[PDB]
Amino acid sequence: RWLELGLTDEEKQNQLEQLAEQYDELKHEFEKKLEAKRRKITQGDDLAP
Amino acid sequence: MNKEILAVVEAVSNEKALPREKIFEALESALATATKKKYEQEIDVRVQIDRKSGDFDTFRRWLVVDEVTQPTKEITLEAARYEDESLNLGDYVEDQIESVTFDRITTQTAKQVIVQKVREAERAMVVDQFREHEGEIITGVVKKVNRDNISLDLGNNAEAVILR
Amino acid sequence: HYIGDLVQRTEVELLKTPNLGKKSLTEIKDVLASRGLSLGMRLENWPPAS
Amino acid sequence: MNLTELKNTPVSELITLGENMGLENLARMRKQDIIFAILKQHAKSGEDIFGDGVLEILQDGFGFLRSADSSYLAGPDDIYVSPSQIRRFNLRTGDTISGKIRPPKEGERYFALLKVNEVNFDKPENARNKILFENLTPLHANSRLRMERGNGSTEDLTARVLDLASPIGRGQRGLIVAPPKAGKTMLLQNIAQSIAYNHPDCVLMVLLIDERPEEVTEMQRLVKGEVVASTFDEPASRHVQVAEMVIEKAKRLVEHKKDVIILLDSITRLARAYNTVVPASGKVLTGGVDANALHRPKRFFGAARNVEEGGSLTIIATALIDTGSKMDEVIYEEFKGTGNMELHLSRKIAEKRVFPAIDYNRSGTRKEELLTTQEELQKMWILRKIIHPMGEIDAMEFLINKLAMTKTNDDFFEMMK
Amino acid sequence: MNLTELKNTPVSELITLGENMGLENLARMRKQDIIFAILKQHAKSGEDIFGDGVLEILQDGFGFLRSADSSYLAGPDDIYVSPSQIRRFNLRTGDTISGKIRPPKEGERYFALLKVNEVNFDKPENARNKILFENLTPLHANSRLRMERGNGSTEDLTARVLDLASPIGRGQRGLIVAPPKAGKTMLLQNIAQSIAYNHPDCVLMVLLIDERPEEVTEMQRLVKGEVVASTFDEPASRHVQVAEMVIEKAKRLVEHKKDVIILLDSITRLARAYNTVVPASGKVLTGGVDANALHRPKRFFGAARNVEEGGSLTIIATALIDTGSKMDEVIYEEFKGTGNMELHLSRKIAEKRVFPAIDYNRSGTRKEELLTTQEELQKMWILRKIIHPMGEIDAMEFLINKLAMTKTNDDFFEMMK
Amino acid sequence: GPEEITADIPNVGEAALSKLDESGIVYIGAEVTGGDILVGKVTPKGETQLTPEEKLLRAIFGEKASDVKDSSLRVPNGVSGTVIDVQVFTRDGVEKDKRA
Ligand SMILES: Nc1ncnc2c1ncn2[C@@H]1O[C@H](COP(=O)(O)OP(=O)(O)O)[C@@H](O)[C@H]1O
Ligand SMILES: Nc1ncnc2c1ncn2[C@@H]1O[C@H](COP(=O)(O)OP(=O)(O)O)[C@@H](O)[C@H]1O
Ligand code: BEF
Ligand code: BEF
Ligand SMILES: [Mg+2]
């Protein structure tokens, strides 16, 4: 839970920011898929007039 | 859930005979009976619904005695070292929370306690308001006659009894 | 480890035992004494014969 | 670990302590939250705790231990006590309680006081045996509270003239009728320094209500006493709460036979807050002020008295007049004929660069003969006789010149002959 | 592509840029929508983006990056950030964040900040290590903020007399008690030009609330500073939102040890908005104003202080009096005894064509000796002594004549001898 | 008036209502042998615009809900079994019950 680290920035900062980008994108894609699934399973269904 | 209890406390018709305080304590007793029915043990507890602030909670009563039967309500006369009791008897705790108060059995026992206490409250109010008449002559219409006792309507939900 | 050794252990050692809160104490007082026995008793013949 | 010796430490010291205790960066949480986390960890290392705080009983019956630096507010650093302890040791509002405390549990949000070792600087056994403050028989002030410092500096005159205008004693009821732009804060600082130097035995209590924060931080580390204040960044609820609880603390201290003195600034803003906190009474007088809204402030003003058995409760409250406010006008009108000790300050002399701007003929003290011997009695009588025909500003400047000509009041009396 | 260097461009420039980028006729969509579409296409061409904006955390916990030109509003040009970044870099409201941003996705409606490279003009590593604004210890103003320009023009007098009436310093609390028809906008423009010329190091912040749009477009391109305003064409929600967020930005800047100065106009309309945005408290005083409705404005007014460690937060708020409004009457009554710096403007002199209409005896500054040496101290004391017996209009015109007779305050002091 | 799935079925024994939940649907894993109420379907027949106050009061004091017609569906006679699953579907806009 403490990904925040840095030393010898010239390459370490680049690799750590790339991994942070990947982590953010993965978490956001998972949250969006979760929200889509929830909205699909929670929306009402037409039954009859 | 607190919205439901607020609705049921505001929807009382005879708010005089049962104001908010005694209605909330009736609901406390009903939830205590519901919690008793929840666990197979027999432990008496209090609720303290927090009438005006928010939702309810539950506590756990000990009734400190030297017995051991039903240890949920058994604490020795000296178990006041840790957990901050500091007293000999009467020390209770908030240990149990998360009481379900909306299922079928809970609703049934709630309605039962509510009707029992509205009967008790109408009885108490009528006796407190027409007891000082002891020694005076008052009229009233009878409504049921039996071989052992008859009933009388005095008005404003007042019931008098006449024995043999 | 033995119930015959735990029955000779009143509550005074439970609330002082480390890592014992309110749920663990409730368990050790409910699922233990509901079998008919009591938490804290006075016996002498233990363990016969081991 | 005591709460005071940990909280009066600077914030940076708390940050370094928490960082040495192996914690997350403490620059995020507030001071109360920092103290809470520090105590949580310091108790996770064992360390049976020793805490203290002023007691407040809520509507439910339990008690909360508030701290002095937070001006008696609610925070995670508070200590909770069940009504069982209050029924056992016979506690009440305003009683400062100090004793052993333990870590909290899951579901609990505050610490628990196990056993009390001090109640208002007394044995917990004698805490249940104490005469009530209301059952006491008030009397007039007898012991003179001399305010003369003795160094004769440019500030000591501020108290010298005071002693030359209206004597003050233990349990006296004091009002300061001063318009704005007058330097009431300077008068309060001078009187606090005088009471801290001359009479360090009696506990000093200074209260600043509805005040700017600069004066709060100035008073909290300039005078020798427990300074509790309340700025205008909070609703009237906190104002009336701290007022009630400081007066309860003073009452408990007097019940413990202790001489307390409460400096209040200002009574007008406190009455304003008490008016806007109370629901309406049905009708309205001029200024938008309710009728019963002044019942609580008036009580607060009447709590001052000289106890015959022991102890005293002196009060000095500053009033705001000449502000063009209908509300303040009616508040001063109500509070005028209420106390026996009054000090009027002239705004015309105040903003004329003649300090301290005092009004001799308008100020005085009822039953002043009980607070001074015949010697100073006759001296002040001669002073009043010679100052009555004089004007306001000329008399004020002549008196301050003749006062600065010497060191103390005795040399002035001798030169007046 | 930065957001500021694209938005501060004229609208026609944005239209031609979008048309060169191969887009539909951009005269239909609004400025925010034009910026959104331009960024969408400029990112569709690759071009890893670099954005910036002031942070706002909602009730959910995520953050939105608002821009200064749109007066911190919600639009398609906003940048979204998840609470994960706020938990990592320890962000808070009012912190301006600048760094790399990416294109959005389907279902997403805002851009995402990938990594921050600047937080309040600081390293993102030190952004988590910063003392809170509330934990700071306020003090009085020490460094004098001189307002004298030095050219002696027909407008410089407006500041000269100011320096002759009430000294002003860093972290000072300022009120402008002026009826309408007085030219408060002219005073604000003069003080902004003075602070931009004399002290360009401290960031200038000017805020116009509930104002006509003409003054908004005048101030946004006349003074040298970041101008955020809010016209009356929006409900009180936007007013209180921009107030809270500009004060959060000022607090963050002070926490970063920066001297900020907030010019506000008017505090009366802002209090009106704060009153109509808050739900009722249960009861009502004269004027239809709620009790707790003034808690937030009062706090806003009390946020000004002189930090002992570093930085300062000066405020100058204009109040509306003499408008015949019960609400404004009670607002001014509440705000009168709140600050230590006040400037009263006389309407009778204002609409008498004698500018600037100032009131000498009514205006002043508490603890003014901490903002000036003994030299100007004695000079201002002599000035007050000579102006006190004089009237209002005659004294004002005599002072402005003797001021225009010279260039600066030193020549006036020398001719006064 | 529209139809409801409330559990307050009047003119019926409490033993029949004991199988239903707080909403009006039988629990998951309840045994039924004969015709028993497993859904609390009610249909109003008389006066409309039932006020919520008197609505909840009928469940406590006073009279019962007359406009019901006792249209609660039951299992046919002879067929038995244990209910294992429930599937509820609501119209767009209508508020769902707690079982949904
Ligand atoms: N005894 C005194 N000697 C010298 N100067 C004084 C004295 N009392 C007040 N002053 C001056 O008068 C000013 C009063 O300021 P302040 O305390 O804010 O007024 P108030 O508290 O009455 O509103 C101070 O700046 C101080 O320089
Ligand atoms: N100090 C000044 N010098 C010259 N003209 C002034 C000055 N103050 C005000 N005015 C004139 O008075 C008018 C006031 O306009 P405005 O700023 O809208 O009023 P206010 O801000 O006082 O409500 C301006 O048009 C300006 O020309
Ligand atoms: F101290 Be000032 F008179 F508000
Ligand atoms: F600026 Be004006 F007083 F509306
Ligand atoms: Mg003062």
Ligand SMILES: [Mg+2]
């Ligand atoms: Mg203007």
